Scaffold this active site. Structure first.
Site, short mmCIF file in Angstrom:
data_model
loop_
_atom_site.label_atom_id
_atom_site.label_comp_id
_atom_site.label_asym_id
_atom_site.label_seq_id
_atom_site.Cartn_x
_atom_site.Cartn_y
_atom_site.Cartn_z
N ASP B 290 0.50 15.10 7.16
CA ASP B 290 1.52 15.05 6.11
C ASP B 290 2.63 14.07 6.48
OD1 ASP B 290 0.77 17.20 4.04
OD2 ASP B 290 0.62 18.31 5.93
N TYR B 374 0.60 22.32 -1.44
CA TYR B 374 1.41 22.91 -0.40
C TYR B 374 2.90 22.58 -0.53
CZ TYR B 374 -1.93 25.61 2.25
OH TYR B 374 -2.85 26.57 2.63
CU LIG Z 1 -2.33 27.62 5.05
#
Ligand SMILES: [Cu+2]
Ligand SMILES: [Cu+2]
EC number: 1.4.3.21
Lengths: 620, 620
Positions: B290, B374
Site C-alpha cells: 500500500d 480497505y
Molecule cells: Cu484483513
C-alpha cells in the site's frame, strides 16, 4: 429478588447473630473471611436460599473452623474444624499486621540490630509479610509472619525510600513470640527521601494542562436495576463483590434479536501472586498471594469523582464484614461508566459512493485496591461489538532494598544506594464459560505454514489448525506467540447460520510465565502460574487456582490436584483459567511513585453471531 | 521559517513551473510521486534550501525520470533516466486504475467469460490491483495491472458481496492492451447483498445510545506554531506529511527542566504489505504494497468533526500534487487532539497517611486512508510519562471470493457461497533514533532463568542479559515472547544521575511475521517482513525497507542490500526498522463491514530520566 444481589448490611448482621447464638463467635474469635455463596447448578432453582461461607480464626490458639450459614432459615448448615498443618492456614487478619512491629520493638535481638545501625526504634516501620513454606520445621501448624524494616524520618515521610537491608524477623502472631532474628550484615540505609508531594522534589507544578470536560447531558446509556444488574447496549450481567476476589461478573449475556444468549457464567480474578527474584536470604522467601493470602476486596479504595473516575459515574458501595461480624460499607468502591472508544467501523466506497462511519463505546466496571506499597486497578470492559476485555493496572511504590556496592544481577538501582529487586505480578482469571449454554469445548488454534510445491506453486499459502482438548490431562497449555496461538471456546451443539459451532476466541498477551526454578517452593504453591491456560470440568468446590487456604500451604493445592482427576471436557460444563502477568525489572522512572503499567487479555466472538452485531448502531 | 514546515500550494506550483521551464513536464508527462526532502545531516546547512523529489512518468512509453529540484533557487539539481526493467516501475497512477475496467469491457475474451456466467458487463466492476513479479516474461519492463471482477446489482450496491471467481485479466495500462484473460471455470456468484445501510439488513436502529459530550472550555493544552510545530506537556515535534508515507513525525523531543532532549529524529510507517494466502491461481499473485505501490497519503480521507474525530479538534490540511503538478489540498486530513487516559499514578500510604491520585492524558495525531475495499487508520500517541506509541486500525470491507463446495484450507466462509481468503497486514516502522543525540546503540534484552543451587538455594532468582548489536550483519533479530525479549536504544555517551546510559525500550506485540514460503516472490520482495527488527547505519538514500521503486520490482533492493555493507552501529547514527502485523483469518463478524482491529508498538523510557517525569502534574 435476584439470587445474585450484593450482600446487604442486614444479611451480614443476621449472619453475626446466628454465629453468636450457636457459640461460634466468642471474644477469642475473628472472622477471617465472609462471603455469599453462588447458587448451585440448577436451571429450575427458584427457592431463595442465601448462604454464606465463613472462615473463623481463634486468637487463643484453638483450631479454626469453616462454617456455612443460611441467612434464609437462620441456621448453621455445617461447621468443620480445620487442621491447618494439613490443609493450610487462614488468610491474614488486618489486625495481625500492627502486631509484628509492636512485638519486635521489645525484642532484644531486634533492638540490638537497630542499635548497631543507630536507628531510633520509634522511627522503624515493619512491613508484615506472608511467610510461605521453607525449611523451618517449627513453623508447621503455626501462624507466622515475616518482617522487613523501613525508616520513617517523620510522620508524613515515605518509609519505602529507607529500607534497612540485611535484617529480617519471623513472628508467631498467635503465641506472640519472635522466633528468629537474622542479621546478615550492615548496609547503609539510603538517605534521599521519596516524598512525591514535596515541592522540593516536584518543582513548580504545571500550569499548562487545560480541562477536559466529559459529560453525559441526557444521563448514561446503561440502567441498573435491583442494585447490581446492568443492562447496556444489548449486554446483560450482574455485578458481584467478594472480599477475597473483589469485583465478580455474573451471567454475562448478549441479546441477539429476541434471544438472551449466555456467554460467561462467572468471571473473576481468582488469584494474584507477586514473586520476588532476589536470592538474598533477606528476601528470597518473599511471595505475595494478594488475593488468597491478603484478600484484595477488603482493601478496596473509596474512589473520588473527577480524580479516580471521570465522567458520568454510577457507584456501587458494597458491604463486607469486619473481624467481629459487623457490616462495613466501602463507600464508592466500584465505578461504572461508559466511554467513547473511537472508530468502530469505517468505509468510503468508490463504486457505491456511500461513506460510512460509526463510533465505538465501552462499558467500564472498575475498582482499586491497596496492599502495602502496591496499588492495583481491576478493569472489566464490554464493547459494542461483543468483545470482553480485562485490564490490570499496576502502580504505587516499588518495594525496595539496598543497592549493593559492586552491583547486582537481581536488583535495579533507583537512587544512590537504593535498589529494587526483580519481581513478577501474575494473575489468574477464572472464566466459568457458558457460550450459548453450558455444553462447551476448547480448541487450540495455531497458524500453519505451508511449503512451496504441488498445490502451492507460488509459495504464498498459509493455513491454520485446531486441536480439541478432550481431557483435563491434556488441557494444560502454553502460549506460542510465534505461531499466533489462541484458544477458542465453542458450543458444539449451537450452530450459526453457516452450520458452524458458535464460539469466542481468547487473545492472550503472551508475557512470560513464572520464572522461578521448577523445584522451588513458589513453583509448587503457585503451580497455576507456570502455564498459560488450564481447562477443568466445573465443580462447585473448585474455586481458586491455589486452593481454599493459601497461607503457609505446602503446595500442590488447587489446579494441579483438580487436573489430576482427568475429567471429560469435550462438550461439557467447563472452566477456563488463564495465567497472565508482568515481569518487572524496575526502572529509574518508576521512582518515587510508579506510572501505571498494564496487562490483560480479551475475548472476541468467533462465529458467535450470524454477521456483524453492530449494524444497528446509528450514525449520530 | 522552519525547514520542516508542510509543503505549501505555492511550493508545488513552483515545482511545476520549474520542471516545465526545464522541459521535463510537457503534455505527455505525469507526476507519479512528489515530496519534500529532509535536510541533510548538518547543524547549519543551507540557511534554508527546500528541495523536492519527483518521479516523472511518460504516457507515450518513453523512459521515466527521477528529478530533484530546489524550489528556493528555481533550479533542477539532478535528473536521471530510469531503466524500470532493472530498478522497478513507478507507483501506480490514479488515472491508470480507471483504464482497466474500460479496456476489459471491449475485449472479446472478457465478454465471452461474462456471457458464460450470464452477467451483464455494464454491472461488472473490476478491482484494479498491483501485478507483482511472477513467471510472465512479457511483463518485464511494462506497466501491468491485474483485474478481479465483482457484480454491482444497482448503483448503490456493495459489489464486494458478489465476487466473480475463476476469472482474472492482465492489462498493459500504457499501450492499452489486454495481455491475458484467464478463466479457470464458472463459480456461482454469491447472491446475498452486503448493504450495511439497508434497513432490511440493519433492522431498526438503536435508540438506546445517549450522547457523550467531550469539550475543552479553555481550549486544548497544546499549541501549534509555524503551521505544524506542536508543543504539548513538555513534548516538542513537527508533524510532516508525505504522499507516500502519510504522516511523518520529525524532531520528537522532551523538555527536561532547562534542556530540550532529542528522542527520535524521524518516525514513519515506511512500508506496508498485505499478502494473500489463497493458492488459487486467480489470487495467488495478490500482494498490496500500500505504501510503496499505491502511496497511502494520496488516498487520505477528509475527517468529519464529531464523527471521525471527537472532542476539541485541531485540523491540518496537507497539500499534495496531482498528476500534472497542480496542488491539491486534503481538507481536514489530519486530526490532532488530547485525550484523557485514565489513572497516571496512585497510592494510598498507610504509614504516611497521604492519599495521592493523578490522571494521565495522551496527544493523538491521526489520519485515515482508503485503498479499494480497505480502510486504515494511523495513530501516533504521546503520553505524559514519556511513552511513544503507534497504533494501526484496520476496518473497511474484507476482500471476497467464492467459497468452494467442499470447503477450503485457505478461505473463510462469511455467507452462503461467499468466502474471504486468509491474509496478513504487515507494517514497517522506520525509527531514525536520536536518544539524547545521534550517538546510539541497540541492545537486545532477554530474561534469564536461573537454576536452584549454590547462590540460589531457594530457586527463586531470575535475571536478564543484554547483548549489544555492533555490526549490521548481526542486527537482524527475531522476537522471543517466551523470554520477554525487548530492545533498548541507548546513548552510551549520555548518562543519567546513576551513571547509566540513558535509553528507551521497544516493546513489540510479538505477532507472527511473514508466513509465505522463503522461496516465494513475496518473501523476496518483502524481505523486511520476515524478521521483527533490523538496525542500519543512517544513510540519506536508505529511505524505504523495500527500496524506492517497489511496483513490479523483483528482489535486490531495500533492507537486505543495506545490511550487506556491515557497517558499525555501536554508538553511531542508527535507524531501527520494526516489523509488526495482523494475521487475518476472517470471521462471520467481519461481514458485511469489519469492526476495527488493531496492532502497534510502543517505546518507554528506560533510565532516560533521573526519576519519574510526571511528579509536577497537578491534582486537577
Ligand atoms: Cu484483513
Ligand atoms: Cu512491580
Amino acid at each position: 429478588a435476584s439470587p445474585f444481589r450484593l450482600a446487604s448490611a442486614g444479611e451480614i448482621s443476621e449472619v453475626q447473630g446466628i454465629l453468636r447464638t450457636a457459640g461460634l463467635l466468642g471474644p477469642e474469635k475473628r472472622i477471617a473471611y465472609l462471603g455469599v455463596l453462588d447458587p448451585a447448578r440448577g436451571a429450575g432453582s427458584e427457592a431463595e436460599d442465601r448462604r454464606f461461607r465463613v472462615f473463623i480464626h481463634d486468637v487463643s490458639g484453638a483450631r479454626p473452623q469453616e462454617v456455612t450459614v443460611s441467612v434464609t432459615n437462620g441456621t448453621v448448615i455445617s461447621a468443620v474444624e480445620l487442621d491447618t498443618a494439613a490443609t493450610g492456614e487462614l488468610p491474614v487478619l488486618e489486625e495481625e499486621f500492627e502486631v509484628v512491629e509492636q512485638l519486635l520493638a521489645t525484642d532484644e535481638r531486634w533492638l540490638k540490630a537497630l542499635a548497631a545501625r543507630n536507628l531510633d526504634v520509634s522511627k522503624v516501620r515493619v512491613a508484615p509479610l506472608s511467610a510461605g513454606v521453607f525449611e523451618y520445621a517449627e513453623e508447621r501448624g503455626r501462624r507466622i509472619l515475616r518482617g522487613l524494616a523501613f525508616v520513617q524520618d517523620f510522620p508524613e515521610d515515605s518509609a519505602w525510600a529507607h529500607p534497612v537491608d540485611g535484617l529480617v524477623a519471623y513472628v508467631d502472631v498467635v503465641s506472640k513470640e519472635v522466633t528468629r532474628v537474622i542479621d546478615t550484615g550492615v548496609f547503609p540505609v539510603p538517605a534521599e527521601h521519596g516524598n512525591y508531594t514535596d515541592p522540593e522534589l516536584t518543582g513548580p507544578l504545571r500550569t499548562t494542562q487545560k480541562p477536559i470536560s466529559i459529560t453525559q447531558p441526557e444521563g448514561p446509556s446503561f440502567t441498573v436495576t435491583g442494585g447490581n444488574h446492568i443492562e447496556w447496549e444489548k449486554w446483560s450481567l450482574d455485578v458481584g463483590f467478594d472480599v477475597r476476589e473483589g469485583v465478580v461478573l455474573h451471567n454475562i449475556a448478549f441479546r441477539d434479536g429476541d434471544r438472551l444468549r449466555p456467554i460467561i457464567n462467572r468471571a473473576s480474578i481468582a488469584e494474584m501472586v507477586v514473586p520476588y527474584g532476589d536470592p538474598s536470604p533477606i528476601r528470597s522467601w518473599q511471595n505475595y498471594f494478594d488475593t488468597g493470602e491478603y484478600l484484595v476486596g477488603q482493601y478496596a479504595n473509596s474512589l473520588e469523582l473527577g480524580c479516580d473516575c471521570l465522567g458520568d459515574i454510577t457507584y456501587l458501595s458494597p458491604v463486607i464484614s469486619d473481624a467481629f461480624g459487623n457490616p462495613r460499607e466501602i463507600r464508592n468502591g466500584i465505578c461504572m461508566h461508559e466511554e467513547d472508544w473511537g472508530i468502530l467501523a469505517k468505509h468510503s466506497d468508490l463504486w457505491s459512493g456511500i461513506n460510512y462511519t460509526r463510533r465505538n463505546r465501552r462499558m467500564v466496571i472498575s475498582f482499586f485496591t491497596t496492599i502495602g506499597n502496591y496499588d492495583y486497578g481491576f478493569y472489566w470492559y464490554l464493547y459494542l461489538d461483543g468483545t470482553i476485555e480485562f485490564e490490570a493496572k499496576a502502580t504505587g511504590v516499588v518495594f525496595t532494598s539496598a543497592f549493593p556496592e559492586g552491583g547486582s544481577d537481581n536488583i535495579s538501582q533507583l537512587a544512590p544506594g537504593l535498589g529494587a529487586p526483580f519481581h513478577q505480578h501474575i494473575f489468574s482469571a477464572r472464566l466459568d464459560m457458558a457460550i450459548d449454554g453450558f455444553t462447551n469445548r476448547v480448541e487450540e488454534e495455531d497458524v500453519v505454514r505451508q511449503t512451496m510445491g504441488p498445490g502451492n506453486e507460488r509459495g504464498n499459502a498459509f493455513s491454520r489448525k485446531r486441536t480439541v482438548l478432550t481431557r483435563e490431562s491434556e488441557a494444560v497449555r502454553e502460549a506460542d506467540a510465534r505461531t499466533g496461538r489462541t484458544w477458542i471456546i465453542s458450543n458444539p451443539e449451537s450452530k450459526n447460520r453457516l452450520n458452524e459451532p458458535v464460539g469466542y476466541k481468547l487473545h492472550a498477551h503472551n508475557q512470560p510465565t513464572l520464572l522461578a526454578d521448577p523445584g522451588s517452593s513458589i513453583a509448587r504453591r503457585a503451580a497455576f502460574a507456570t502455564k498459560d491456560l488450564w481447562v477443568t470440568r466445573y465443580a462447585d468446590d473448585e474455586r481458586y487456582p491455589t486452593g481454599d487456604f493459601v497461607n503457609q500451604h505446602s503446595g500442590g493445592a488447587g489446579l494441579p490436584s483438580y487436573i489430576a482427576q482427568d475429567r471429560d471436557i469435550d462438550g461439557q460444563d467447563i472452566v477456563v483459567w488463564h495465567t497472565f502477568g508482568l515481569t518487572h525489572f524496575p526502572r529509574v522512572e518508576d521512582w518515587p511513585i510508579m506510572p501505571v503499567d498494564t496487562v490483560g487479555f480479551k475475548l472476541r466472538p468467533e462465529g458467535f453471531f450470524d454477521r456483524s452485531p453492530v449494524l444497528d448502531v446509528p450514525a449520530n
